[PDB]
Amino acid sequence: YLTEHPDPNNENIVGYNNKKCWPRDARMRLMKHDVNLGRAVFWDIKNRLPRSVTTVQWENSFVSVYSKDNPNLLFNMCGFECRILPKCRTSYEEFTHKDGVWNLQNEVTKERTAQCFLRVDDESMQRFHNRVRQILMASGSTTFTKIVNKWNTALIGLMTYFREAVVNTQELLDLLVKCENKIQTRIKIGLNSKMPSRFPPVVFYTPKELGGLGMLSMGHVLI
Amino acid sequence: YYRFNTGPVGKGPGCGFWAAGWRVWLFFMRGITPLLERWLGNLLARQF
Amino acid sequence: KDKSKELHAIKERYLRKFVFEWDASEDTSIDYNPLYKERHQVQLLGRGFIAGIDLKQQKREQSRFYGDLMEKRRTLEEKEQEEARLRKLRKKEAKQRWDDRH
Amino acid sequence: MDFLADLMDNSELIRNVTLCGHLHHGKTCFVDCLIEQTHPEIRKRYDQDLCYTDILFTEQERGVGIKSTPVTVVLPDTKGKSYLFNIMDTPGHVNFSDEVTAGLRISDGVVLFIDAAEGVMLNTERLIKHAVQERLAVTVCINKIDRLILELKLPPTDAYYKLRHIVDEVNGLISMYSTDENLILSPLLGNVCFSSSQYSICFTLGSFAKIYADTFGDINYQEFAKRLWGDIYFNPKTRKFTKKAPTSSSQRSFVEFILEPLYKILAQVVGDVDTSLPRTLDELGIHLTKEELKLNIRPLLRLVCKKFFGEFTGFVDMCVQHIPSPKVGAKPKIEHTYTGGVDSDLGEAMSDCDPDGPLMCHTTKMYSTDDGVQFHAFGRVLSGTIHAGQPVKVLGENYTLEDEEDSQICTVGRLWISVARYHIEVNRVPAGNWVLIEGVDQPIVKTATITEPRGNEEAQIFRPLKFNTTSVIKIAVEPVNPSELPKMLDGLRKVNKSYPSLTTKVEESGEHVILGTGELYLDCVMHDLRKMYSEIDIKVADPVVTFCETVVETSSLKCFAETPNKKNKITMIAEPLEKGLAEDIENEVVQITWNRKKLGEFFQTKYDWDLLAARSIWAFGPDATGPNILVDDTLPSEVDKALLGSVKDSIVQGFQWGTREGPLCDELIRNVKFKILDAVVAQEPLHRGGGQIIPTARRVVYSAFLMATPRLMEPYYFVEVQAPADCVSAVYTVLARRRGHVTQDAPIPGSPLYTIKAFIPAIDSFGFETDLRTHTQGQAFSLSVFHHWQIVPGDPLDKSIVIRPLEPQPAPHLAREFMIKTRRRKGLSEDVSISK
Amino acid sequence: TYQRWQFTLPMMSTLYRLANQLLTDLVDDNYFYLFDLKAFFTSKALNMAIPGGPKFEPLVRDINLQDEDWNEFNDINKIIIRQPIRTEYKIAFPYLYNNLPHHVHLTWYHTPNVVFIKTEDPDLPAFYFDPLINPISHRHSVKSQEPLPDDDEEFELPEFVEPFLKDTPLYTDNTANGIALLWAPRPFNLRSGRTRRALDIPLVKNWYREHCPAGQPVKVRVSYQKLLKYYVLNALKHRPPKAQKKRYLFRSFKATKFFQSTKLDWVEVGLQVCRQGY
Amino acid sequence: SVLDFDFEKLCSISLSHINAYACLVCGKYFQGRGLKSHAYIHSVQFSHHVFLNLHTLKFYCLPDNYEIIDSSLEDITYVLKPTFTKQQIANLDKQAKLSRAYDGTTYLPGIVGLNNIKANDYANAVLQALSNVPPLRNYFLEEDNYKNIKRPPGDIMFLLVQRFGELMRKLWNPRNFKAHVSPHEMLQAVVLCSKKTFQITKQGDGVDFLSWFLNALHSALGGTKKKKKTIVTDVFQGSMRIFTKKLPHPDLPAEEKEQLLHNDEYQETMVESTFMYLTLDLPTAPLYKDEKEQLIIPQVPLFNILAKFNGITEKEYKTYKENFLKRFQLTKLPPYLIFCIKRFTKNNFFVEKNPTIVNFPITNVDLREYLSEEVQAVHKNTTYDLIANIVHDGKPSEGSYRIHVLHHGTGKWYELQDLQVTDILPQMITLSEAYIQIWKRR
RNA sequence: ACUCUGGUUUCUCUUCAGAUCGCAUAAAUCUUUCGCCUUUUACUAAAGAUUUCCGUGGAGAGGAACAACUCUGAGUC
Ligand SMILES: O=P(O)(O)O[C@H]1[C@@H](OP(=O)(O)O)[C@@H](OP(=O)(O)O)[C@@H](OP(=O)(O)O)[C@@H](OP(=O)(O)O)[C@H]1OP(=O)(O)O
């Protein structure tokens, strides 16, 4: 790769791609050797595929390296960012407290050899927020039941897709609670121009069988 | 009050240093008065 | 606690609704470093007199290190002059206290 | 104003002098007073001083001078004509004093400054010792005399006693530093000038005597100064200097006739406007206008003192009396600075300072232009006259007669020798005068000698510049983005030329490391780099201290390496150096160039080393100054003595390479007595491969260091923290937190302050001054300069517990983690291999 | 006009005596080590705020310097931290201990320690060796290493040559007052100057500018920090473009025939204004 | 093993350009010497007993003692030292010979497919097109002629120009080994000399970069010397006798127009414009496609460039309030004709490029005769062939460039793109929006 | 010791702002982001650019008031 593309100024890591969602200590170790290997592999892949039939742009790609320098691997998966960390490399006070990780073992060793910490992808969270914005957008004359059912479908879909990632990702919880309050305020302003001082939650959670909106929510509101 | 009641002076309401807030209120009033003058002129005119 | 305080400090370094008055959540003076947390008050060797601090209380609150050193270093004539000055000051203080609550 | 250029021709009317200061404020105030006296156009504002010596904006904003300013003018004298004084004002910081070291070669006379209230300081003592070791004249100046008069309000007799104590301490320090008979300094001798540098109040005994003669009578000023200077007492009945002190209640002559009038004038001025009444002014022979009286107390006092005390004639007279002309003073400078010896014909001609002889100018200072694109090399012209456009060969600091390629020819544009107005009207400058050569900046980095192209073919550059301080604080430099990496590198080069103390090294790990002495020094370096030399934003690393590797125990087993050519093997054993030898060798006490008999006598007398051991081939690190010495103890019974003589150069090169790059962290190694046990090698020259010895030699060095007990060494910085008495104990508390040890603590004589000399490790020294000043709530002040290497606790290669990434390690574990981190950061293999 | 005042030294002495209660005893600017306006400026120009300094909203998002990725040299595996790099270190040397300092301000390094002794008793002479001043070695030093003059052989001085300033008291009663005023705060250091308005003389200003009112509850700290924030924000944006024509609108209204001038008590004017507002 | 001489010559350990000897085997240049310095350490570590000198390029005969090169491996020495005299330039001008490089590639004198920076590749293409002229290579190879002009110490333009010329001569020299040449040194010199304008950090406009380079070249050769007419400037100077008329503003009525004419406002005034490179603007873009709704390409005939004799002389338009009549008339046509299409133009909101085809045949032209009929005697060689044409491609934001140049005399007419080295046929070359064209009078 | 030297308080009027206009400190609008977010009054909080607003200095002009007392430098004094 250096023969094909020299790197005398060490500018390879100048425009590297990394996942900003993960914390600093685990996102990506942009060591010179790891960056050089990533660029070399990307160049090899781009050379093995003709630029006419298809293409692999670097500006919209992702590479992860695991070695003596970088101890983690990053996968984007099916719209879910998951980092794998072997147990044999670092301990860092290993414990079984949260459910946001996955215990993976070997067939022969029959012991937990690596843990996969997963979270909703930034693209997936943005798409869900855009869907919520679309639902709140078509509220000029739509029925309240239609709006609340659209929210129920959206929240149910997201939870059924990645419950573990929803629980793990604090940002996902914050954004879902924020847009849930957005829709609740939309219903309130639909009821009256002003804002209720108390806004009782019986209306928003009584099932439609009993005559209510029946909004399924992932929040925690104490009646 | 913290300083006034620093020592032998009681911890009661007996503090008399109004100048410190008086100057701040004077400055804020000086900033505000253009708005009041402009609106009062708008009312005093015929294009209210 | 101090060791853990330094630990998370280094980790952090590297890794409408009307309100009546200010809130204590904005305080920044909380520093775990005992040297920075407990800063030696600048008494100016018996010459430090803060404005709002009571003069008599400040004299009582003074560490008296400078006063004790001056008393030790003062000669017999200097000690006599200081004793006379403090006696006159005490007489003046008695004169003022006589007027108060008379 | 053409007399400024006219006086430059007279080689006997020049007074090459460099200034020193406890703090840059005091010296620059004096320089500004001198400029105001010489230049009537520039007048200091009432709010703040002009500070004409602070050219850089960084110094102006920070308040501490950054770069030395070589600016002065023709100044008159009381009993003499105007002499073209040229003064290189130096910064008043412990680290920045390294820049003043350059001035040590600019001039042959140091007009040292000492604050009256502050007294002796660590910076002042270090500067005095360095000047004494530099063989230059010293004329002391009691600075801030108004502090004792006004700030302390001390009695006149007590003030005189304090001044005498300060002078006595200075004289004792000078006598300890140098044994020359000219060490006597006193107002009677003319080596002490009382110059407050504030309110323009400067004088000597001769100045006061001349003022007395001008006021009334016709008393000989020289005799009066010789009499009234000391404590000889004055008898009014006898009306003469009576050493027996006849009068019971009389005051000393200096106190009665010199200090007392100044005290009376200050009391009248500061006390009240009615105290400094027009009657008092008339009694003093001054008639100030109503406008001058309406000014505030400080401007009124400044005007009164300036009008009453002349125009600093006493300082000029004192400098002329002792600081020699360049013609007289060139011979000692030729003997000291020149490495070619004064016995050389060109050297002998330079010792005579012949303008019409060969051209030999030594440029050591480097100054950036206003645009910052180009530089200008400032230096003294020892011999010859430089002309605009005349080509010259600029031999660098590393130039030698072995290779002529080390020097390059370049043209010299405008000279701009005059600096007071910073103008470039100078066309040619004679010998002995400072010249700011333009256009020759590119071939030379720093401390390089320019010479005529074809007139001389054997003249060599002067000795390389040496500094008392040692750069121990290292910091990495990287660009924010590599896209414009070379641009930053350009600025880096501009840093290397501008600051002689700063050392830019391209480490093997692809990191550009800047080595400096103090934290403020490196901060100023980075500010100049970002703002001026390279506008690119630069990312840095946490400051690190250069570490040393030492030995405590002798090597257990011998270590031998075989040359590839027919297996020629050299075996050696390393032993720790004798206690106290490291600083002795490092102080240039003994050089490898010394005669074998002289070195043997020195070692047998001082350190009681064996005569056979002394007669062995001695290396003593790089440039004979490295504390790690090498002795070739090979047995003469072996037939390798001829081979050793034929391989002595290769062995020395291998030893110096190993000294520069050790086995642990590849850093400098000191206090290692490498004993070359033996060597078996084929006598055939073909088997004596030059490249097969130095790698083998350094491998032997590494194995011997591993065979011996290895230890890490950190540079303990001396800090003379001055603080008020109440905080003194609290100051120790700071040293308690930063692993500091208090060496001494004494009250300041005549001042309520209190000095504490402490030895702070460099690892914890980063930000120590900030902690001391903030904890003491802005009262205590500190100043830290590197003092000596001290062995760090623990073992570099012992298998110890790995420390947490963000937690300080325990004391026994410091050495191993220091070693591993340094090895990894340098780019070499982290793990230390015993086999390697 | 009452615009400029020319006064005497004793009046400053007595006014400073009276105002000692409202004025702090600090005389050297080194006390405001990291509390001068430049320290707060360079703190605001960064995310980090000193413990004694107020917090600030960052000027920009600054996501580039928020959480940088691990690099070859930026890795904490190699950086050794003997002591925490506190905000004091960054503020003291912004160009060294701060990656990408960018737009910052420069702080004053040091000021020589003001060695001053405040007068304790007026009767005692000013030029007196105060006990706090450290004693000096009054060594006999019978040796004569210093040069010595002739013994009753030269230096014949005329009797008309007096030691210059004579028949004048070296120490006077006003010396102590003046030398104390010479190290007064800003208002009293000036012998004579120009007036300032009543509303723009901040008495409390010197209070919060101090390091801290030590021994105070948390709420006092919070109030001091917030008011220091307000003061530093006031100090930041301070540039008048107002090259006015000095059109005194109030004077023109006074000259208007629709209004007249008179003299009356302040309380009468106050009740007049209350009635007018009603 | 690696030829890194394309990058800037600097120390690998000392960061100094003085006495920077290069490792003959390792390939790293350090400022140290053979004994007790950085180069000594490199020799004792890399085991490379030979190291080429900084200036003489003398490989170390001994590991540390002496530095004397061997003529056996003088290929790198000849590559780093372009020394083709005029007699050798004639051989260089005889490009028909198969000038295989050291590695076996194609030399392509002036049209070598050297590597270009990722950004501002238009500047690299412009430099290559300028270097594609054998006169440019001959001028660059004349180091003695180049060194004749004194270089002022204050200005760094002369040094950057000299470095760029040396790099171009090395690229055009047959002694080169690798077809791809790193423009890092050239890009840095261009950025430093041009005050960061047209820097390699971001994509730069071809016309602006070419104008800046021409101005810098003129400044390098021109100045205080008696030869004010710089060789680079005089090669492509030109002269337009534009009888500019300050015609009245359109808002002025007929009476105001008559008053201005009586006041000689609309009088023609000769401009004597330098016109270093002709700037021919394409006509208006087709707002609505009529023939084929998918895309309408209004090809501009080459006579539009030749229309500057009268069409430019009939221009009565300006962006100011007064409708200035340009009345452009090119008097003296330079031997080198550099036509700039200037397809990019800023609209009221965004800058857009006209996709109109060039439609410019590569044959003889008669615009010089049309511009001035009497000048035909002076301009005997009016048959100018388009030597090198560079066309932009892609979107205006994320776009690139591609050029095709013909060797003088040989007439290869090959594409200068590194991948498509040999492309003689036009292959609808005029179909794309040619960014610029360069032709020689011949 | 000799000749000329000649006001400062003030009131307004008209300009120009250098100078921390001011050793104090507000407000309005607009602009970009941050909390945004429920529409404007608004905000939160910083940056950027204006404006008003409290004030001030320089300089010039015109009357009143001490205009006759000169201050003061020059005038070899
Ligand atoms: O409501 P906060 O701002 O917290 O302060 C109030 C109160 O202040 P106001 O008078 O402004 O309502 C009192 O203050 P003063 O009466 O002194 O002015 C009182 O103080 P005292 O008890 O000293 O009278 C007391 O403060 P604290 O009890 O802490 O001294 C109390 O604060 P809390 O509401 O927090 O009790």
Structure description:
- The structure is cut from a larger assembly and holds three copies of chain A, one copy of chain C (102 residues), one copy of chain D (836 residues) and one copy of chain F (442 residues).
- With 223 residues, chain A is an alpha+beta fold.
- Chain A contains six helices and four strands, in the order αββββααααα.
- Chain A has helices at 32-48, 122-137, 144-161, 163-168, 170-191, 202-205; strands at residues 73-75, 80-86, 101-105, 112-120.
- Chain A is elongated, with a radius of gyration of 23 Å.
- Chain C is elongated.
- With 102 residues, chain C is mostly helical.
- The longest helix of chain C has 24 residues, at 76-99.
- With 442 residues, chain F is of the alpha+beta class.
- Chain F has a five-stranded antiparallel beta sheet with strand order 8-14-11-12-13, with helices on one face. In chain F, strands 2-1-3 form a three-stranded antiparallel beta sheet, covered by helices on one side. In chain F, strands 4-7 form a two-stranded antiparallel sheet.
- In chain F, β9 (344-346) and β10 form a beta hairpin.
- In chain F, α4 packs across α9 (206-221), α5 crosses α7 and α7 (157-172) runs antiparallel to α8.
- The chains are: A alpha+beta (223), C mainly alpha (102), D alpha+beta (836), F alpha+beta (442).
- Chain B binds chain E through residues 2-3, 17, 19-20, 22-23, 26-27, and chain E through 199-204, 207, 213, 216, 220.
- Bound molecules: inositol hexakisphosphate (IHP).
- The site of inositol hexakisphosphate (IHP) has 3 residues of chain B, from loops.
